[PDB]
């Protein structure tokens, strides 16, 4: 009879589902009119199927998704674990804000993780204090070391229950942190993502988030809504883009220091970058 499950991967041209109750990995086939209609199914999709245990099962229906990450297709993602690096990979605030813009656009909770702390000397630490100085009040920050183990237990606290996606520049330590959180687990024909179950309940995606940092589906005038800070600020004009406009609460805030310059700076850069399109 009808049982609820979460899709976790696509094996041998078939959907692999996991039983929401207390189930194992039941392989499946989608039947019905999903054919007639165009109701596509993805990893992370919640579904209800028929347990013909005498050989896997059959997917009867696919629930409605809260969202759908793209390239590595993933549905119903709650969190973005943004792993950042001050030294070694060197992460610019610009890249960081593009990541946040993306996480916000897909309406996801974001947890910023400054990794490789074990490698930082005094100058590096200063750069760290600058990251906290910028993002402290906009997002949760956790200082970690995949090697030392520093900050992992605290990070396990955010992964619990939720379906999470790792994001960050190559080399920043995404796969190493994963293994630090759950020995054995690791980041990545077979072009679809997979959901890895955490020891403590919850899942993390096979491959990394928006690795292609593609901000195009965003209209210029839309971008401003993806910078938390820009909101409680009042600007003269109706829907002021905060760039040239004559009077801007946002521009005012920057001259004050209520808004980090880097934030404004990167937002404007991104703004103009989106304008170049017809
Ligand atoms: N010292 C130190 N090295 C780390 C840390 N995390 C990852 N690394 C190293 O950084 C390299 C890249 O890590 P990896 O997890 O593969 O990066 P990813 O591309 O973000 O998944 C590997 O050679 C690791 O040995 C960390 O917290 N501290
Ligand atoms: Zn404005």
Contacts by residues 149-154 (CB-CB < 8 Å, ≥ 24 positions apart): 149/180, 150/117, 150/118, 151/113, 151/117, 152/177, 152/180, 152/181
222 Cα: distance to centroid of ligand 2 (angstroms): 13
247 Cα: distance to centroid of ligand 2 (angstroms): 7
Tell me how the structure was determined.
X-ray
List Cα–Cα distances, 26 to 29, 103, 161, 162, 206, in angstroms: 10, 31, 21, 21, 19
Locate the ligand 1 atom nearest the alpha carbon of residue 172 and give its number.
Answer: 20
Name the pairing type of β-strands 141-143 and 109-114: parallel
56 is in an annotated binding site: no
187 Cα: distance to centroid of ligand 2 (angstroms): 41
Which ligand neighbours the alpha carbon of 251 most closely?
2
3-state DSSP assignment of residue 149? coil
76 is in an annotated binding site: no
Half-sphere exposure of 151 (CA within 13 A, CB side): 19
Largest CA distance in the chain: 70
Cβ contacts of residue 15 below 8 Å, gap of 6+? 7, 27, 28, 29, 30, 41, 47, 59
Pocket test for ligand 1, best of 145, 173, 187 (most atoms within 8 A of CB): 173
31 Cα: distance to centroid of ligand 2 (angstroms): 52
Residue numbers after which the chain is interrupted (C to N above 2.5 A) read 188
**Nearest CA residue ID for atom 6, ligand 1:** 173
Q: How many residues does the chain have?
A: 278
Pocket test for ligand 1, best of 116, 148, 171, 176 (most atoms within 8 A of CB): 176
173 Cα: distance to centroid of ligand 1 (angstroms): 4
Locate the ligand 1 atom nearest the alpha carbon of residue 145 and give its number.
Answer: 27
**Nearest CA residue ID for atom 2, ligand 1:** 116
168 is in an annotated binding site: yes
Distance CA 44, CA 60 (A): 16
Distance CA 29, CA 198 (A): 26
Do residues 87 and 124 make contact, with C-beta atoms less than 8 angstroms apart? yes
Which among 56, 44, 14, 49 is positioned nearest to 32, based on CA atoms? 49
Q: Strand pairing partners for 10? A: 15
Give the 3-state DSSP-derived string for 246-277, with helices as H, strands as E and coil as C: CCCHHHHHHHHCCCCHHHHHHHHHHHHHHHCC
Q: To one decimal place, what's the resolution in Å?
A: 2.8
Domains of the chain listed by start with CATH number: 1-64 (2.40.50.140), 65-215 (3.40.50.300), 216-278 (1.10.40.50)
């Amino acid at each position: 009879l009808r049982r609820r499950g979460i899709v976790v991967s696509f094996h041998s041209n078939m959907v692999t589902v996991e039983d929401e109750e207390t189930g194992e990995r039941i392989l499946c086939k989608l039947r019905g009119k999903f054919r007639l209609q165009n109701l596509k199914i993805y990893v992370g999709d919640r579904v209800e199927y028929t347990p013909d245990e005498t050989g896997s099962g059959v997917i009867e229906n696919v629930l409605h998704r809260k969202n759908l990450l793209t390239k590595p297709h993933v549905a119903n993602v709650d969190q973005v674990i943004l792993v950042v690096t001050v030294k070694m990979p060197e992460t610019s605030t610009y890249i960081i804000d593009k990541f946040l813009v993306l996480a916000e656009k897909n309406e996801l909770e974001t947890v910023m993780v400054i990794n490789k702390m074990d490698l930082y000397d005094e100058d590096d630490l200063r750069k760290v204090r600058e990251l906290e100085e910028i993002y402290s009040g906009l997002y949760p920050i956790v200082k970690t070391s995949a090697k030392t183990g520093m900050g992992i237990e605290e990070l396990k606290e955010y992964l619990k229950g939720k379906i999470s996606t790792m994001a960050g520049l190559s080399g920043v330590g995404k796969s190493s942190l994963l293994n630090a959180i759950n020995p054995g687990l690791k980041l990545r024909t077979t072009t679809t993502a997979q959901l890895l179950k955490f020891d403590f309940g919850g899942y993390v995606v096979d491959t990394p988030g928006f690795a292609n940092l593609e901000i195009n589906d965003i209209e210029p005038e839309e971008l401003k809504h993806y910078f938390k800070e820009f909101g409680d600020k009042q600007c003269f004009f109706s829907d002021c883009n905060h760039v040239d406009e004559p009077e801007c609460g946002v521009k005012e805030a920057v001259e004050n220091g209520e808004i980090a310059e880097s934030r404004y700076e990167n937002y404007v850069k991104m703004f103009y970058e989106l304008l170049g399109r017809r």
